[PDB]
């Protein structure tokens, strides 16, 4: 994120890090529950990829993070790679995430929920802070 | 690429006014936000776009795409979870 601000460590508990076997942060996720991660189709996650829960400082060594494995990748069969439409993938964990003060779930909207233009929400990530 | 977790607030826009920027790229399963002096960027993808509903942060968007240069004056594009939740529900139930 560009022009963001550092967040309070663990104030955004469903926020996870998608990291390759190399330790490289390549995408983000959202813990919808202890057994499932929600991310973007286009992120091309594999079962060789790892799910990092309750981290804050990607470079901190004293963090009690949870490096959870991915049993299966359930890709929206309606993802259009040509247009990046229905850009969503589900992640099914091998090992259940241990919910805590810092590891918890996000809520999902009812297909029925309304969310008006002008409404101020929040995005979070370890995306480039600069172009 | 920040070691530190970032946060940002930004307005949610309509497709109509969003198409104003991205043209016929903005489809039904996409919701725009930003163009407010802040922007999601490379590495942010798959992460959450959350709106507080009735006391609780709800998953309304998934950082998908936008500006090649993560321009703060152009609206970032996100997956619309609401058109996808049915799929997600159906997916959990079976598995």
């Amino acid at each position: 994120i560009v022009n963001g601000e550092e967040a309070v460590p663990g104030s955004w508990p469903w926020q996870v890090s998608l990291q390759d076997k190399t330790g490289f942060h390549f995408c983000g996720g959202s813990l919808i529950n202890e057994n499932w991660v929600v991310t973007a189709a286009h992120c091309g996650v594999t079962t060789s990829d790892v799910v990092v829960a309750g981290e804050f400082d990607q470079g901190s060594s004293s963090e009690k993070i949870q490096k959870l494995k991915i049993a299966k990748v359930f890709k929206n069969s309606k993802y259009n790679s040509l247009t990046i439409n229905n850009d969503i993938t589900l992640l099914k964990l091998s090992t259940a995430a241990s919910f805590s003060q810092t590891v918890s779930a996000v809520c999902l909207p009812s297909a029925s929920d309304d969310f008006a233009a002008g409404t101020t929400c929040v995005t979070t990530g370890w995306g480039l802070t600069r172009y | 690429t920040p070691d530190r977790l970032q946060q940002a607030s930004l307005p949610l826009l309509s497709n109509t006014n969003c198409k104003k920027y991205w043209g016929t790229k903005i489809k039904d399963a996409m919701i725009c936000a930003g163009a407010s002096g802040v922007s999601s960027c490379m590495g942010d993808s798959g992460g959450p776009l959350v709106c507080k509903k009735n006391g609780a942060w709800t998953l309304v968007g998934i950082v998908s795409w936008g500006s090649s240069t993560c321009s703060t004056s152009t609206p970032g594009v996100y997956a619309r979870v609401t058109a996808l939740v049915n799929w997600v529900q159906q997916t959990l139930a079976a598995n």
Partner: peptide, 10 residues
């Protein structure tokens, strides 16, 4: 769901 144990200070 969606109620952090530790509050975001925006």
């Amino acid at each position: 769901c969606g109620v952090p144990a530790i509050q975001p200070v925006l």
